[PDB]
Design an enzyme around this catalytic site. Sequence first.
Site, PDB file in Angstrom:
ATOM      1  CG  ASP A  39      -2.221   0.764   1.022  1.00 15.46           C
ATOM      2  OD1 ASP A  39      -2.139   2.011   0.965  1.00 15.46           O
ATOM      3  OD2 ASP A  39      -3.317   0.155   0.980  1.00 15.46           O
ATOM      4  CG  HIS A  69      -5.115   4.051   1.127  1.00 19.63           C
ATOM      5  ND1 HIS A  69      -4.686   2.789   0.778  1.00 19.63           N
ATOM      6  CD2 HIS A  69      -6.427   4.109   0.783  1.00 19.63           C
ATOM      7  CE1 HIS A  69      -5.695   2.106   0.254  1.00 19.63           C
ATOM      8  NE2 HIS A  69      -6.761   2.887   0.248  1.00 19.63           N
ATOM      9  CG  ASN A 161     -13.485   1.494  -3.910  1.00 24.65           C
ATOM     10  OD1 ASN A 161     -13.880   0.556  -3.216  1.00 24.65           O
ATOM     11  ND2 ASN A 161     -12.270   2.024  -3.777  1.00 24.65           N
ATOM     12  N   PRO A 175      -8.754 -15.183 -10.190  1.00 26.17           N
ATOM     13  CG  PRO A 175      -9.422 -16.603 -11.901  1.00 26.17           C
ATOM     14  CD  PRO A 175      -8.427 -15.543 -11.581  1.00 26.17           C
ATOM     15  CG  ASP A 200     -13.153 -15.159  -3.766  1.00 22.87           C
ATOM     16  OD1 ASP A 200     -13.547 -16.142  -4.425  1.00 22.87           O
ATOM     17  OD2 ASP A 200     -12.186 -14.448  -4.103  1.00 22.87           O
ATOM     18  CB  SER A 224      -9.138   0.526   0.277  1.00 25.33           C
ATOM     19  OG  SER A 224      -8.522   0.589  -1.004  1.00 25.33           O
ATOM     20  CG  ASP A 260     -27.171 -12.440   7.359  1.00 21.01           C
ATOM     21  OD1 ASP A 260     -28.352 -12.850   7.322  1.00 21.01           O
ATOM     22  OD2 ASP A 260     -26.292 -12.948   8.088  1.00 21.01           O
TER      23      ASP A 260
END
Length: 279
Positions: A39, A69, A161, A175, A200, A224, A260
């Site tokens: 990052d 960040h 995003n 994948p 996932d 993020s 949910d």
Amino acid sequence: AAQTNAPWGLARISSTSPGTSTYYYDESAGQGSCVYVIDTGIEASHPEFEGRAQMVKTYYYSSRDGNGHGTHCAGTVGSRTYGVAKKTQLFGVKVLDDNGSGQYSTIIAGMDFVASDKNNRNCPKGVVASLSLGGGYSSSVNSAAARLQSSGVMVAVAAGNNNADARNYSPASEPSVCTVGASDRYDRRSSFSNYGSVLDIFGPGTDILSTWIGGSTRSISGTSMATPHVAGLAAYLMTLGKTTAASACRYIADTANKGDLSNIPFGTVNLLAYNNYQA
């Protein structure tokens, strides 16, 4: 263990229902595991890291998180107050500049660095990498992530995003790594969160309070922010010996809260990261 008045995200991953404020977790807390935060870097001197954070690599004129960040993501992984795995070891790899931007060539180099570097480190419970980064589809970037995973690291990456299918983003669309979308405190898919078959798992990503530079804190939003919830949870579950780097993503999907979330597009998993901690 129990953390009262925890950030909603931490509370969420230890509950079957939204709206609670206590984070329940096994006190092992990811001790013996290591998470590489790939990052903008990490302010390792932040008190919240308690000395459990260190930079190991930078690709720019400085190692410092001049952005915040990376410190924020690292905080969600393993800070005392805002972290999922509060005793994990944190390694900073700065592939993003102080504007939060980075070339793909650098990011790739970064992944390759971590795959090798883990062999210099003492991480008996296993190694995780958290990548709260990404852009358009890249075969080379995807391959880099897959190499890192194949090398024996639990790789977790942000879905993006763009409120779009993450099939068009990298390393999100690889994948073989763990692709993480974002939700809010009301179990809605975050308005910005990418979706798609390649996801996932979901984690808390809207309004996430964590560490920031200058020894401060703030609440920001993004896949993020969701990504390091899952990275931290991986490290936590690995320390408990419940799963391995290779299978952690599957295990997290196996044991997730199911159905949910709202506004999940057809063909996108309805699974929310969950530690299933029973004292």
